[PDB]
Each structure stands twice: as C-alpha cells, then as structure tokens.
Write a protein that binds this ligand. Structure first.
Ligand SMILES: Cc1cc(C(F)(F)F)c(C#N)c(=O)[nH]1
Length: 284
C-alpha cells in the first residue's frame, strides 16, 4: 500500500489513536534491572522510562557504569543511534563521558532547557566562548568554539578535552529550538531541513561513533528523528521503495528502547515527514 494511501484512509476513518495502541500492544518488553537498582535512583529523570539491559550504553568506569541511554542498531539500513534522556544536574559529567567513549561526532537536541515553565534538562554546554566548563568527576573540559543561530535551529561547534590524556576532539551540537510546547509541528518542512543539516555534517555517518540524540525523556521527539531518518534511508536503499512500512520499522527500533513515539499526533507527524521526504529521495 503506498504509504500515502494508507495515510489517507487512516486520516479519513479517524483512526490514529487506534493504530497507535496496536503498536503499543506488540512492542517488545525486555528487562531493565540495572536502571532500577537503588544506587541508580538519582540517574533517571523519569520513573517509567528506562534503558533495556541488553542495549544499554555502559560507561568505562569501575564504580558505576550506569547512564539512561540505549544503543539502537538498524542493521539493513547500516545506521546506529544513541537515544538518551536530557542530562540532569548530577549526570552532565556522565553524558560527556559517554560522548567521548563512544566516539560520537554529533549531539542532537530536540527540546528547550525550559518548556511549559519547567526545567526539561540541565544547561549542559557553555553559553559563551570565554567561559568553559570542567566536569570534575569524569576528567573533562568543554569549550564553546562557535555558534550559528538560525530561525528554526542553532548549530554549535564545541571542543571536548579528556584532561587525563590531553586528547581533544571536535563535537557538533545540532539544536532544534522550535518544537511547539504542545502537540507537533504543522508542516514537517523545518524538521526535514534540520535532519538534512545533521546528515550533511557527517554526524550520522559510519566513519564516526553513533550520534547522540535526546529530548526530555529520550523517546518521543527522539524517536521521531530516528524513525524518519531510517525510513528514508531504506527507501533509497531498496529495490522496492514502496515496501517500506513505517509501523514495522518502529517496532524494530522498539526492540532497543521502550516507548519511542509517545503520542498518536507524533505517529501521524512521522508519516507526514517521511512522505514529504520521499519527494527528495526519489530524484527530486
Ligand atoms: C527485522 C528487521 C527490520 C528492519 C526494519 F526495517 F524494519 F527496520 C530492519 C532494519 N533496518 C532490520 O534490520 N531487521
């Protein structure tokens, strides 16, 4: 069924909440024993959003290797992603340790530090060039190199130093600053423009570690980014582009982290984004 035809029949019958509950019913359910140990209690932003044990990202430390982050591997597509929660006050050093240890090139942030009059994350990168940050706990220095503020997003160059060794690496911060407080955007055009800006940078390419992607909980907004990116990749890759089924790709991705796409509005938007993206993909 050409994805767009399925979109029209679902939209006309008014059945997005219905379809979404079905995906939630067939989703995998694996154990997250480590996320729940008493010691890890202040490392989780939300009581009901946890990394599955089989796919969790482990820190290289002997003390406590735990972070709320999952490795998502889409095999046929040849693309991996790290999905994580917005850092907390006491996990900002762990966040930057993960970026270093996994060799990531880019970080994608899809929330504002404050939304709905509350804090969704910590201010985990420097606001100014001359005022760097040290994370004592993980032996790291982070420096703002450059900022490029656009209408729908901001792009930043950061330098990360492991003070243990004196090695430095350049990290790219892609910040989508315009998701509305409520709901999803009206047109996917600015979100697709943003996705392609991340792609262009090399941040999603196989010669780097996996990209790190986060929103507040790391499952909603994040899930949409990854779902859209994987579905366009497979359309470009397969012999039959129309054999790409969004529902199947989602369920495959939910094998690695719980709860990816949190509302039927967000599922509906992910179809829109892929559909509009296929005009590019397909020679246009
Ligand atoms: C079973 C399965 C499904 C998918 C799906 F396409 F759906 F995402 C991929 C990918 N990529 C895979 O490697 N195995």
């Amino acid at each position: 069924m050409e994805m767009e035809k399925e979109f029209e029949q679902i939209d006309k019958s008014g059945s997005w909440a219905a379809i979404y509950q079905d995906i939630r019913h067939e989703a995998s359910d694996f154990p997250s024993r480590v996320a729940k140990l008493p010691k890890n209690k202040n490392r989780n932003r939300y009581r009901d959003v946890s990394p599955f044990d089989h796919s969790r990202i482990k820190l290289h430390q002997e003390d406590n290797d735990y972070i709320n982050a999952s490795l998502i591997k889409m095999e046929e597509a040849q693309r991996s992603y790290i999905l994580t929660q917005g850092p907390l006050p006491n996990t900002v050093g762990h966040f930057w340790e993960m970026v270093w240890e996994q060799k990531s090139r880019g970080v994608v942030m899809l929330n504002r530090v404050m939304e709905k009059g509350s804090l969704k994350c910590a201010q985990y990168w420097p606001q100014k060039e001359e005022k760097e940050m040290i994370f004592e706990d993980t032996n790291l220095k982070l420096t703002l190199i450059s900022e490029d503020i656009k209408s729908y997003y901001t792009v930043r160059q950061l330098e990360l130093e492991n003070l243990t060794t004196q090695e430095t690496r350049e990290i790219l911060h892609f910040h989508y600053t315009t998701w509305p407080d409520f709901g999803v955007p009206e047109s996917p055009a600015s979100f697709l423009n943003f996705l392609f800006k991340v792609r262009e940078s090399g941040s999603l390419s196989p010669e780097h570690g996996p990209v790190v992607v986060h929103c507040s909980a790391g499952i909603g907004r994040s899930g949409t980014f990854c779902l859209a990116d994987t579905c366009l990749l497979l359309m470009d890759k397969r012999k039959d582009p129309s054999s790409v089924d969004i529902k199947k790709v989602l369920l495959e991705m939910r094998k690695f982290r719980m709860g990816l796409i949190q509302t039927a509005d967000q599922l509906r938007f992910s179809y829109l984004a892929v559909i509009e993206g296929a005009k590019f993909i397909m020679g246009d």
